Design goal:
Two copies of one chain form a homodimer.
Chain A: E1 8-11, H1 16-27, E2 33-36, H2 47-52, E3 60-63, E4 66-69, H3 71-81, H4 93-109, H5 116-126, H6 133-155, H7 168-182, H8 192-205, H9 207-225, H10 234-245
Organism (chain A): Homo sapiens (Human)
Subcellular location (chain A): Cytoplasm, Cytosol; Nucleus
Pfam families (chain A): GST_C, GST_N
Chain lengths: 248, 243
């Protein structure tokens, strides 16, 4: 409800696109007031938050009167407004097209697929709901196919997903792949090219930045096990039920 | 010369087709028959390994994803600013819609074609429970489109037609073409469609929508091609991702 003097970012580091924007702002030293909005508790569906963003999704950027959603949109906005190093989002027509191509494919094949293990293992059981085994198997196969395409189409024999340098594409991809990794799905094993890529991206980001970005997600399974997670609000419950029923 | 590989039965294919035609961008149009499975053939997999439409080929440079294609074409051919405004916040609004679209529209609004035509074509019924869940999901997404994106503004991302309106319209056309009259009872959405279609022109709209608008009749009359085994495989995978 209350604001800081400038740029506010409403986020929860349990969320993949929140972590992507967090990392981008931190790495570029973009001065940003972090406002934590607790997803599990349901604070993104609170009256106060819906007043800011009627969609009630994270991350949300507030720049004065200007309120903006969608990590890709937020990332591009900040990169321009703050004139970040070119490699992140290259001016070059074709190099930029490669970043947009990845982002488009990501929205389709990664987003909404790689997050599912959190629902299976933590969030569903948290409200008494099990994800059927057949769906879990389907999701695992879907993840493996997507990693194969990630390796073959995008990475190739190149250092990063959209060319010779780290772009927004790499940031988005990593934070999504981190979700199953944090729950004990070791996605990089048996995938040497992908493993090398991760090492490359994380080396660039810095160990300390990666640590603080990934801290929450790396502890969530254990916190769920010790039953220290918040009880979802009725609004969060409703949204959770809908999300779970969207698992194919 | 540029080539566009496309099939007008497909929503993102139509969006790119419309943008190019409205802007007079000279493209070699190359029809790739999706139902037959030409997108999964060796010759096309040799061009786009992902075997997905639309695909744009610019000499050596091969590009997929309608959003990426649209942006690329807009900069390459320097189309009128309004399609993709250079203004920081106007542009962010376009990206914001496109991202939300990929999550809430793309993959949801196409489902009735699978229910009514494509599934039955290969002996697969979509369970009623999924059909009803999909209908509810469409209605919820339409509500966000009206309340959050349009509001009382003329278009989805501001005062003028942008890439956002093109993608939205072509996705919404899919259920419409299959008998879901979803602009009924939703004045803001109906007015928006009227605005977008008036800007594009009746002939371009007619040309873009002709194929999808005749697909139910083709299914009823049983004149649709038999899918290749590769198409069949992909169809089963797509049907199984309906929740």
């Amino acid at each position: 409800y209350f604001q800081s003097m400038g740029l506010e970012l409403f986020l929860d580091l349990v969320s993949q696109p929140s972590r992507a924007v967090y990392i981008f702002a931190k790495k570029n030293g973009i001065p940003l007031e972090l406002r934590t909005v607790d997803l599990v508790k349901g604070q993104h569906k609170s009256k106060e938050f819906l007043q800011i963003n009627s969609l009630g999704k994270l991350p949300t950027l507030k720049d004065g009167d200007f309120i903006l959603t969608e990590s890709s949109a937020i990332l591009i906005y900040l990169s321009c407004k703050y004139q970040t190093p070119d490699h992140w989002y290259p001016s070059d027509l074709q190099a930029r097209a490669r970043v947009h191509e990845y982002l488009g494919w990501h929205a389709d094949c990664i987003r909404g697929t790689f997050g599912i293990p959190l629902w299976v293992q933590v969030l569903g059981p948290l409200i008494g709901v099990q994800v059927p085994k057949e769906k879990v198997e389907r999701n695992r196969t879907a993840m493996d196919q997507a990693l194969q395409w990630l390796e073959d189409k995008f990475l190739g024999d190149r250092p990063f997903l959209a060319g010779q340098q780290v772009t927004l594409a790499d940031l988005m991809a990593l934070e999504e792949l981190m979700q199953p990794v944090a729950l004990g799905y070791e996605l990089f094993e048996g995938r040497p090219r992908l493993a090398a890529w991760r090492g490359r991206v994380e080396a660039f980001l810095g160990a300390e930045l990666c640590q603080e970005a990934h801290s929450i997600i790396l502890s969530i399974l254990e916190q769920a096990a010790k039953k220290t997670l918040p009880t979802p609000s009725p609004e969060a419950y409703q949204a959770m039920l809908l999300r779970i029923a969207r698992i194919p």
